[PDB]
Amino acid sequence: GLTGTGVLTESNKKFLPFQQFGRDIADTTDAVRDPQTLEILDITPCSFGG
Amino acid sequence: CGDSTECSNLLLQYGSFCTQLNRALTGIAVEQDKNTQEVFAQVKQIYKTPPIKDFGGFNFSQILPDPSKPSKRSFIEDLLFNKVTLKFNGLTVLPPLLTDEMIAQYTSALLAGTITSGWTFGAGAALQIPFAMQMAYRFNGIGVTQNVLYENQKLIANQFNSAIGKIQDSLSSTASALGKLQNVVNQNAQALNTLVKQLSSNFGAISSVLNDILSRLDPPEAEVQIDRLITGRLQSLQTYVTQQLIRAAEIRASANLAATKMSECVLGQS
Amino acid sequence: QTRAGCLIGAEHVNNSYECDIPIGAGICASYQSIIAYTMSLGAENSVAYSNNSIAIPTNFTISVTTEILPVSMTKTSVDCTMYICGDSTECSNLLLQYGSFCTQLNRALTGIAVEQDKNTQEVFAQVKQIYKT
Amino acid sequence: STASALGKLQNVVNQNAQALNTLVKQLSSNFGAISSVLNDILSRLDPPEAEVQIDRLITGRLQSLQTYVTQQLIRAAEIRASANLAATKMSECVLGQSKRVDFCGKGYHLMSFPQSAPHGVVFLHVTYVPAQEKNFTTAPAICHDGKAHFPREGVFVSNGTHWFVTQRNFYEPQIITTDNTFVSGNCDVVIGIVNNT
Amino acid sequence: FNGLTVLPPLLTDEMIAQYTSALLAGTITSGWTFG
Ligand SMILES: *[C@@H]1O[C@H](CO)[C@@H](O[C@@H]2O[C@H](CO)[C@@H](O)[C@H](O)[C@H]2NC(C)=O)[C@H](O)[C@H]1NC(C)=O
Ligand SMILES: *[C@@H]1O[C@H](CO)[C@@H](O[C@@H]2O[C@H](CO)[C@@H](O)[C@H](O)[C@H]2NC(C)=O)[C@H](O)[C@H]1NC(C)=O
Ligand SMILES: *[C@@H]1O[C@H](CO)[C@@H](O[C@@H]2O[C@H](CO)[C@@H](O)[C@H](O)[C@H]2NC(C)=O)[C@H](O)[C@H]1NC(C)=O
Ligand SMILES: *[C@@H]1O[C@H](CO)[C@@H](O[C@@H]2O[C@H](CO)[C@@H](O)[C@H](O)[C@H]2NC(C)=O)[C@H](O)[C@H]1NC(C)=O
Ligand SMILES: *[C@@H]1O[C@H](CO)[C@@H](O[C@@H]2O[C@H](CO)[C@@H](O)[C@H](O)[C@H]2NC(C)=O)[C@H](O)[C@H]1NC(C)=O
Ligand SMILES: *[C@@H]1O[C@H](CO)[C@@H](O[C@@H]2O[C@H](CO)[C@@H](O)[C@H](O)[C@H]2NC(C)=O)[C@H](O)[C@H]1NC(C)=O
Ligand SMILES: *[C@@H]1O[C@H](CO)[C@@H](O[C@@H]2O[C@H](CO)[C@@H](O)[C@H](O)[C@H]2NC(C)=O)[C@H](O)[C@H]1NC(C)=O
Ligand SMILES: *[C@@H]1O[C@H](CO)[C@@H](O)[C@H](O)[C@H]1NC(C)=O
């Protein structure tokens, strides 16, 4: 149910056993947990510029 | 809009606000570069201190560049750099034209020129002069005859040396002496942070995310909700731009004062 | 590939000249084809310091240089009722319920114009009489 | 011969013209209404929605006008600061000779001349620049008869065999005499003093 | 235009040229005394 774009990589963060997704500051998501494998991933915005 | 076709189509009919916003930001960046270049680029050549240093007993070790460190910075410059502390959502930060090494090179050239050639290099070609005679001229310039300096040289030198050491300690131990630069950095960071934070507001709509609005209603009222979101975000962007303009004007005034002080006090006696 | 991004259509050279078209991170490009290079701060020399040596000029030159400073800009005036309504009674009546949002604009513009006139008069009227050669 | 030397006044004029041009171009936007011309809205439909369309037009145009006014205020403040600086320069470097270095001209200031320009002023600064240097050997004081002599103004120099006193900014040697020097103490505490007559 | 007007400056360029001429004649003839 959480939708968004970006590139997904492997992360080493340690989600405590009941969180689902993480945000750092200014309320922007950085990590998610897939509901099947139960592993923590990492989201990065794919590149852009002028 | 965040890569939404409907948002772009709706925004297309508000004219050309973004062109002038980007124009203002580009002008601000160009002004910053001009400020730095005007402040620091005062000399025409790059002077170098002689390998042997005997300036009548004076000791400039703490402020002369140190070849050991790759940065080629002095002790005080390293202390100042270590003292202060500090592509996300469609916003970018552009690097300055002048790197820190070039600023250090300008500072070293100015220091070597004023140490070796007195004030002559600021009005033509650098002219060699022993340091003690230059300090005699500087005393003669404030109404004290040079007779004094030559008869009180060593003591005077000692005093100078001690003073230099003192400020190093005043920078090494005591903090909060550089509040202005830290304040500028904090202001910029806070403004950017709140501008990013504004994305989560509602502005009177039913949700703060476009996808939920699109995937829960037919277009007829989706347009109304998207219009509310668009006008709120546009107002926030305009406020941020205006604040940036005001701060840029103040910074430009400060930079002009700094350039005047550098011209009048480093290249000559005031 | 440079600290400022990526660049296509120019060649990187090992020399260093003055900066023509600034690019960033200490590099810029110029037309020769187009060449991109690290900016050069200036010439290099070492003054011959010694504890018993001096240099004294023997001749002189006289130089004339120019400096340019703006002092004023054009004075403009804008009428709200014609700009946003264009001689329409209904538009005027509708605008009448927004309070006094345009008296402020007129006051601001008049202040700007008066300031421009004061700027010019204060810069140039530095003398009391008119002298003749 | 060479043009493009007056970029500042050109920039001011271009900024003003661009601001006016975008302000007048803003009149051709729908702002979410059915048309960009008010006469069509008035003549095409019944008022109870005409006020809605006109309200959208009004709010858009008000926003544009406010933005223009704020930009004009900022630019006017900047121009006023520049005008104050120009007035100070005219007062100091034209009505008198200035001692503060590099305030007006590169070198030692002699005088300045003003000229007008369509929206500004141009200063012509006349400056004195030394040239054609030469090496010399120098000493801080002269020991004679157990006494130390310092120059009243100038500096001691030597071409290799004899010593002279010269003014600092121009080479003009003269014989050392008891009229252009003064005595203080004995030649025992001055570092670098030399023997002469 | 649609309500945009440009007002002429109070000091015409002839008077500005006259001020510049007076200043330059004064500084040529009387040095800095006239200031
Ligand atoms: C969801 O179902 C999948 C598939 O049955 C589970 O994945 C299995 O996990 C076990 C435990 O490590 C492995 O031995 C199997 O090889 C996995 N199968 C596949 C097809 O990957 C997964 O564990 C289940 N997760 C939950 C939370 O029920
Ligand atoms: C100038 O001052 C510096 C101190 O900043 C002196 O460097 C010290 O020199 C002594 C003796 O050589 C060493 O024991 C210290 O460790 C040095 N200090 C540092 C921080 O390196 C330097 O010697 C002085 N200059 C002269 C000519 O004496
Ligand atoms: C003055 O004396 C010096 C020392 O003999 C002359 O030599 C210059 O020395 C500096 C640094 O030692 C070099 O950078 C120059 O290239 C030397 N000049 C030469 C070799 O011609 C110097 O030439 C003399 N004259 C002046 C005007 O400095
Ligand atoms: C100081 O510089 C001036 C100008 O460079 C010298 O005057 C020149 O002298 C040469 C040789 O006599 C003439 O060919 C030039 O025509 C002169 N220039 C002008 C503008 O008249 C002057 O000789 C130099 N002073 C000394 C002592 O060498
Ligand atoms: C240094 O200056 C002195 C004074 O001008 C020079 O002495 C003169 O030298 C000329 C040329 O040799 C003689 O014709 C004069 O008779 C000398 N005057 C006296 C009072 O002796 C001296 O030659 C100069 N030294 C150098 C190395 O140039
Ligand atoms: C200027 O510096 C030179 C160094 O080049 C000094 O000459 C030294 O003087 C001491 C003391 O008389 C001697 O022990 C050294 O042997 C000298 N060195 C050389 C290379 O000759 C000179 O004394 C200094 N002069 C002044 C006035 O400071
Ligand atoms: C300048 O002259 C004085 C005296 O004419 C010199 O002082 C003499 O120095 C020698 C050697 O050091 C001593 O043996 C004498 O006793 C000194 N005489 C007096 C009266 O003090 C002095 O050395 C000379 N200066 C230099 C640099 O040689
Ligand atoms: C010249 O530049 C090339 C890259 O353009 C570099 O590989 C080479 O080492 C450089 N040569 C020198 C002498 O710096």
mmCIF file of N, CA and C in Angstrom, chain B residues 94-158:
data_model
loop_
_atom_site.group_PDB
_atom_site.id
_atom_site.type_symbol
_atom_site.label_atom_id
_atom_site.label_comp_id
_atom_site.label_asym_id
_atom_site.label_seq_id
_atom_site.Cartn_x
_atom_site.Cartn_y
_atom_site.Cartn_z
ATOM 1 N N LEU B 94 24.635 23.441 -5.920
ATOM 2 C CA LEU B 94 25.685 23.607 -6.911
ATOM 3 C C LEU B 94 27.016 23.913 -6.238
ATOM 4 N N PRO B 95 28.112 23.348 -6.733
ATOM 5 C CA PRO B 95 29.416 23.585 -6.113
ATOM 6 C C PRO B 95 29.940 24.967 -6.451
ATOM 7 N N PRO B 96 30.734 25.565 -5.568
ATOM 8 C CA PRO B 96 31.318 26.875 -5.868
ATOM 9 C C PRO B 96 32.381 26.779 -6.950
ATOM 10 N N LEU B 97 32.575 27.899 -7.648
ATOM 11 C CA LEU B 97 33.564 27.941 -8.722
ATOM 12 C C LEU B 97 34.981 27.794 -8.182
ATOM 13 N N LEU B 98 35.275 28.427 -7.052
ATOM 14 C CA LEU B 98 36.610 28.425 -6.469
ATOM 15 C C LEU B 98 36.694 27.341 -5.401
ATOM 16 N N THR B 99 37.667 26.447 -5.540
ATOM 17 C CA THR B 99 37.896 25.424 -4.535
ATOM 18 C C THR B 99 38.664 26.008 -3.351
ATOM 19 N N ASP B 100 38.695 25.248 -2.255
ATOM 20 C CA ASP B 100 39.363 25.723 -1.046
ATOM 21 C C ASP B 100 40.863 25.879 -1.253
ATOM 22 N N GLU B 101 41.461 25.043 -2.103
ATOM 23 C CA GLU B 101 42.889 25.162 -2.372
ATOM 24 C C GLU B 101 43.218 26.496 -3.029
ATOM 25 N N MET B 102 42.364 26.955 -3.944
ATOM 26 C CA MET B 102 42.602 28.239 -4.595
ATOM 27 C C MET B 102 42.468 29.395 -3.609
ATOM 28 N N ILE B 103 41.498 29.314 -2.696
ATOM 29 C CA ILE B 103 41.368 30.337 -1.662
ATOM 30 C C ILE B 103 42.611 30.359 -0.783
ATOM 31 N N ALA B 104 43.106 29.178 -0.407
ATOM 32 C CA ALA B 104 44.325 29.113 0.390
ATOM 33 C C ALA B 104 45.514 29.682 -0.371
ATOM 34 N N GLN B 105 45.579 29.437 -1.680
ATOM 35 C CA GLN B 105 46.668 29.985 -2.482
ATOM 36 C C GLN B 105 46.614 31.507 -2.526
ATOM 37 N N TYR B 106 45.420 32.077 -2.704
ATOM 38 C CA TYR B 106 45.282 33.530 -2.645
ATOM 39 C C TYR B 106 45.714 34.075 -1.290
ATOM 40 N N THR B 107 45.280 33.426 -0.209
ATOM 41 C CA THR B 107 45.651 33.892 1.122
ATOM 42 C C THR B 107 47.160 33.836 1.323
ATOM 43 N N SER B 108 47.792 32.745 0.886
ATOM 44 C CA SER B 108 49.239 32.616 1.020
ATOM 45 C C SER B 108 49.967 33.665 0.192
ATOM 46 N N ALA B 109 49.486 33.933 -1.023
ATOM 47 C CA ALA B 109 50.116 34.951 -1.855
ATOM 48 C C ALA B 109 50.020 36.324 -1.206
ATOM 49 N N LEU B 110 48.844 36.669 -0.679
ATOM 50 C CA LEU B 110 48.691 37.952 0.000
ATOM 51 C C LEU B 110 49.612 38.047 1.208
ATOM 52 N N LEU B 111 49.685 36.975 2.000
ATOM 53 C CA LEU B 111 50.522 36.995 3.194
ATOM 54 C C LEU B 111 51.994 37.152 2.840
ATOM 55 N N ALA B 112 52.470 36.405 1.842
ATOM 56 C CA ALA B 112 53.866 36.523 1.437
ATOM 57 C C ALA B 112 54.162 37.911 0.890
ATOM 58 N N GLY B 113 53.244 38.459 0.089
ATOM 59 C CA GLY B 113 53.454 39.789 -0.451
ATOM 60 C C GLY B 113 53.549 40.849 0.627
ATOM 61 N N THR B 114 52.640 40.813 1.605
ATOM 62 C CA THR B 114 52.690 41.834 2.646
ATOM 63 C C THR B 114 53.869 41.620 3.587
ATOM 64 N N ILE B 115 54.307 40.373 3.774
ATOM 65 C CA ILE B 115 55.458 40.123 4.636
ATOM 66 C C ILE B 115 56.740 40.621 3.981
ATOM 67 N N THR B 116 56.883 40.415 2.673
ATOM 68 C CA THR B 116 58.160 40.700 2.030
ATOM 69 C C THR B 116 58.248 42.104 1.441
ATOM 70 N N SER B 117 57.195 42.583 0.782
ATOM 71 C CA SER B 117 57.272 43.808 -0.002
ATOM 72 C C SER B 117 56.568 44.990 0.650
ATOM 73 N N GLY B 118 56.144 44.862 1.904
ATOM 74 C CA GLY B 118 55.429 45.960 2.536
ATOM 75 C C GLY B 118 54.090 46.196 1.866
ATOM 76 N N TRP B 119 53.787 47.465 1.599
ATOM 77 C CA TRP B 119 52.556 47.841 0.917
ATOM 78 C C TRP B 119 52.776 48.183 -0.551
ATOM 79 N N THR B 120 53.989 47.982 -1.068
ATOM 80 C CA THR B 120 54.288 48.400 -2.433
ATOM 81 C C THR B 120 53.581 47.521 -3.457
ATOM 82 N N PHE B 121 53.479 46.218 -3.187
ATOM 83 C CA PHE B 121 52.914 45.295 -4.166
ATOM 84 C C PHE B 121 51.453 45.590 -4.469
ATOM 85 N N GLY B 122 50.775 46.344 -3.612
ATOM 86 C CA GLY B 122 49.409 46.734 -3.873
ATOM 87 C C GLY B 122 49.244 47.934 -4.773
ATOM 88 N N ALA B 123 50.346 48.518 -5.250
ATOM 89 C CA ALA B 123 50.277 49.685 -6.119
ATOM 90 C C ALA B 123 51.255 49.574 -7.280
ATOM 91 N N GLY B 124 51.521 48.357 -7.744
ATOM 92 C CA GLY B 124 52.459 48.160 -8.829
ATOM 93 C C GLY B 124 53.253 46.877 -8.704
ATOM 94 N N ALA B 125 54.577 46.988 -8.733
ATOM 95 C CA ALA B 125 55.465 45.841 -8.624
ATOM 96 C C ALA B 125 55.996 45.728 -7.202
ATOM 97 N N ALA B 126 56.021 44.502 -6.685
ATOM 98 C CA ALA B 126 56.505 44.268 -5.330
ATOM 99 C C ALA B 126 57.959 44.699 -5.200
ATOM 100 N N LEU B 127 58.259 45.437 -4.134
ATOM 101 C CA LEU B 127 59.598 45.948 -3.879
ATOM 102 C C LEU B 127 60.133 45.348 -2.588
ATOM 103 N N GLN B 128 61.301 44.722 -2.673
ATOM 104 C CA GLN B 128 61.911 44.080 -1.520
ATOM 105 C C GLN B 128 62.288 45.107 -0.457
ATOM 106 N N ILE B 129 62.181 44.694 0.803
ATOM 107 C CA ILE B 129 62.477 45.557 1.944
ATOM 108 C C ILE B 129 62.636 44.692 3.191
ATOM 109 N N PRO B 130 63.680 44.895 3.995
ATOM 110 C CA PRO B 130 63.789 44.151 5.256
ATOM 111 C C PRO B 130 62.634 44.474 6.192
ATOM 112 N N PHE B 131 62.238 43.472 6.981
ATOM 113 C CA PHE B 131 61.024 43.590 7.785
ATOM 114 C C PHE B 131 61.160 44.651 8.870
ATOM 115 N N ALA B 132 62.332 44.739 9.503
ATOM 116 C CA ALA B 132 62.518 45.708 10.579
ATOM 117 C C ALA B 132 62.340 47.132 10.072
ATOM 118 N N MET B 133 62.869 47.431 8.886
ATOM 119 C CA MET B 133 62.688 48.759 8.314
ATOM 120 C C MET B 133 61.228 49.031 7.975
ATOM 121 N N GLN B 134 60.498 48.009 7.523
ATOM 122 C CA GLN B 134 59.073 48.181 7.266
ATOM 123 C C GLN B 134 58.316 48.504 8.548
ATOM 124 N N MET B 135 58.645 47.817 9.642
ATOM 125 C CA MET B 135 57.995 48.128 10.911
ATOM 126 C C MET B 135 58.395 49.510 11.412
ATOM 127 N N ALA B 136 59.621 49.945 11.111
ATOM 128 C CA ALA B 136 60.016 51.313 11.433
ATOM 129 C C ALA B 136 59.161 52.318 10.675
ATOM 130 N N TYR B 137 58.913 52.059 9.390
ATOM 131 C CA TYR B 137 58.009 52.911 8.622
ATOM 132 C C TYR B 137 56.616 52.922 9.236
ATOM 133 N N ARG B 138 56.144 51.760 9.686
ATOM 134 C CA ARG B 138 54.793 51.683 10.229
ATOM 135 C C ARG B 138 54.670 52.453 11.541
ATOM 136 N N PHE B 139 55.693 52.399 12.401
ATOM 137 C CA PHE B 139 55.702 53.291 13.562
ATOM 138 C C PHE B 139 55.754 54.754 13.146
ATOM 139 N N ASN B 140 56.596 55.086 12.166
ATOM 140 C CA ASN B 140 56.698 56.473 11.728
ATOM 141 C C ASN B 140 55.367 56.983 11.192
ATOM 142 N N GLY B 141 54.520 56.079 10.707
ATOM 143 C CA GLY B 141 53.228 56.465 10.169
ATOM 144 C C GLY B 141 52.169 56.795 11.205
ATOM 145 N N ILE B 142 52.400 56.485 12.478
ATOM 146 C CA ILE B 142 51.420 56.755 13.525
ATOM 147 C C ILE B 142 51.912 57.834 14.490
ATOM 148 N N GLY B 143 52.911 58.614 14.092
ATOM 149 C CA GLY B 143 53.395 59.702 14.912
ATOM 150 C C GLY B 143 54.432 59.332 15.946
ATOM 151 N N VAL B 144 54.976 58.121 15.895
ATOM 152 C CA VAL B 144 56.061 57.700 16.772
ATOM 153 C C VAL B 144 57.318 57.578 15.928
ATOM 154 N N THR B 145 58.382 58.255 16.348
ATOM 155 C CA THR B 145 59.616 58.247 15.579
ATOM 156 C C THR B 145 60.229 56.851 15.554
ATOM 157 N N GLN B 146 60.870 56.524 14.428
ATOM 158 C CA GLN B 146 61.467 55.203 14.255
ATOM 159 C C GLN B 146 62.569 54.933 15.267
ATOM 160 N N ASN B 147 63.166 55.991 15.825
ATOM 161 C CA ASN B 147 64.150 55.865 16.895
ATOM 162 C C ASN B 147 63.751 54.812 17.919
ATOM 163 N N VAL B 148 62.466 54.753 18.272
ATOM 164 C CA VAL B 148 62.016 53.825 19.302
ATOM 165 C C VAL B 148 62.244 52.381 18.872
ATOM 166 N N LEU B 149 61.793 52.020 17.666
ATOM 167 C CA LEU B 149 61.734 50.610 17.289
ATOM 168 C C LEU B 149 63.103 49.949 17.365
ATOM 169 N N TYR B 150 64.107 50.559 16.737
ATOM 170 C CA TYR B 150 65.436 49.967 16.717
ATOM 171 C C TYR B 150 66.024 49.814 18.111
ATOM 172 N N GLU B 151 65.583 50.621 19.072
ATOM 173 C CA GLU B 151 66.084 50.512 20.434
ATOM 174 C C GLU B 151 65.226 49.612 21.311
ATOM 175 N N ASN B 152 64.125 49.081 20.786
ATOM 176 C CA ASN B 152 63.265 48.175 21.539
ATOM 177 C C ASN B 152 62.822 47.019 20.658
ATOM 178 N N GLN B 153 63.724 46.532 19.805
ATOM 179 C CA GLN B 153 63.336 45.529 18.818
ATOM 180 C C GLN B 153 62.960 44.211 19.481
ATOM 181 N N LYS B 154 63.919 43.575 20.162
ATOM 182 C CA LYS B 154 63.701 42.228 20.682
ATOM 183 C C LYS B 154 62.440 42.158 21.526
ATOM 184 N N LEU B 155 62.322 43.049 22.514
ATOM 185 C CA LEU B 155 61.134 43.074 23.357
ATOM 186 C C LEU B 155 59.871 43.120 22.513
ATOM 187 N N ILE B 156 59.809 44.053 21.558
ATOM 188 C CA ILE B 156 58.631 44.157 20.706
ATOM 189 C C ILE B 156 58.350 42.820 20.044
ATOM 190 N N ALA B 157 59.380 42.216 19.444
ATOM 191 C CA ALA B 157 59.192 40.926 18.796
ATOM 192 C C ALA B 157 58.580 39.929 19.764
ATOM 193 N N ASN B 158 59.152 39.826 20.969
ATOM 194 C CA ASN B 158 58.622 38.892 21.951
ATOM 195 C C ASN B 158 57.133 39.112 22.146
#
